[PDB]
Amino acid sequence: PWSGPEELELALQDGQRCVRARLSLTEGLSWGPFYGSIQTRALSPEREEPGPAVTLMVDESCWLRMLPQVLTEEAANSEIYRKDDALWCRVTKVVPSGGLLYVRLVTEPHGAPRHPVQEPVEPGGLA
C-alpha cells in the first residue's frame, strides 16, 4: 500500500490513491523522526526555482510524499519539519476520520550564513 502509520490510511478508491485520516488526527499529536531531508527554499519562487527545486527527499514508499504538498496552513493538517537533521511530523489541525489531509513542508528561511569561522571579538561576556 504505502509506508505509512496506522493513524493514516491509503485508500484506493476507483484506483485513486487517497490519503485519508484513518483515525481522527488530533492537533498536537506527532510522530517520531523520519530519515530523509527537505531542501527548503532560500530563494523566491516568483523569481527563481518554483518547481522541483523544493522537494522532500524521503523514501518513495513513505507516506510523507504521498500527501499533497501545501505551503498554506488551511490545507495542511500536518507539517513536516526538520529537527536535528531528522524530519518530524506534527498534526496541526484536527482531521476527522475519512477526511483528506495535505502536508505542509517546512520552509523556514534559516538564513544559511554558514558557521561563524570568525570568532566573536573578545568572547566570554556580552552575550
Domain ranges of the chain: 1-110
The residues near 72 (Cβ < 8 Å, ≥ 6 apart) are 104
The residues near 41 (Cβ < 8 Å, ≥ 6 apart) are 49, 53, 54, 107
Q: How was this structure determined?
A: NMR
Of 112, 111, 62, 109, nearest to 89 (Cα)? 62
Nearest 5°: CA angle at 115, between 113 and 121? 100
Looking at the chain, which runs of residues are DSSP E strands?
Answer: 8-13, 16-21, 37-38, 56-57, 69-70, 76-83, 86-91, 102-105
- Is residue 51 classed exposed, middle or buried when 0-12, 13-18 and 19+ CB atoms within 10 A define those classes? exposed
